[PDB]
Amino acid sequence: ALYKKFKKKLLKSLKRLG
Numbered sequence: 001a002l003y004k005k006f007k008k009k010l011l012k013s014l015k016r017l018g
Contacts, residue, residue: 012018 009018
């Protein structure tokens with residue numbers, strides 16, 4: 001598991017695109 005940690009970063013990116 002880990003893809004959820006980078007996905008977290010995709011959360012911030014989901015908003016402003018990172």
